[PDB]
């Protein structure tokens, strides 16, 4: 027997003598009030598979980034059609020879 006077390594009882314990894992039901099971399992019915939510993230990622291109014009700090409102360094190019 394993749990005895220093009699370790019980051969037929491998799940003690090995180090396979659930440290903090309780198991009981009724953690939640009942109808969230209804409201959330009837809500995640669509994307409950491997390909489904993986398609959803593709759809949303595309439909977010591609529209970020042409309606992320909320100043983006500089580039998006706010541009150089001064002729910045056109003729300033070189130090000894100007070169434009």
């Amino acid at each position: 027997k394993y749990g005895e006077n220093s009699r370790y390594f019980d051969l037929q009882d491998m799940e003690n003598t090995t180090g396979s314990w659930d440290m903090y894992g309780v198991d009981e039901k009724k953690r939640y009030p009942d109808n969230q099971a209804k409201f959330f399992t009837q809500a995640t019915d669509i994307i409950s598979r491997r390909e489904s939510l993986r398609a959803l993230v593709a759809l949303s990622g595309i439909a977010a980034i591609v529209t970020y291109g042409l309606k992320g014009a909320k100043d983006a700090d500089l580039p998006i059609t706010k541009g150089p409102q001064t002729t910045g360094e056109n003729g300033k190019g070189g130090s000894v020879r100007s070169r434009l």
Binding site: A58, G61, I65, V66, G69, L70, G72, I80
Partner: protein, 37 residues
């Protein structure tokens, strides 16, 4: 007869900066870890 539109960097840059790396890395990562039957 060929010209890309004015809005073309705004769309094509984050596409190839964020989307194609994401699809590439996810697809390759599924490919790497697959078990042979």
């Amino acid at each position: 007869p060929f010209v890309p539109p004015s809005w073309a960097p705004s769309v094509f840059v984050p596409l190839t900066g964020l989307v194609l790396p994401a699809i590439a890395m996810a697809t390759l990562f599924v490919y790497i870890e697959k078990e042979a039957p």
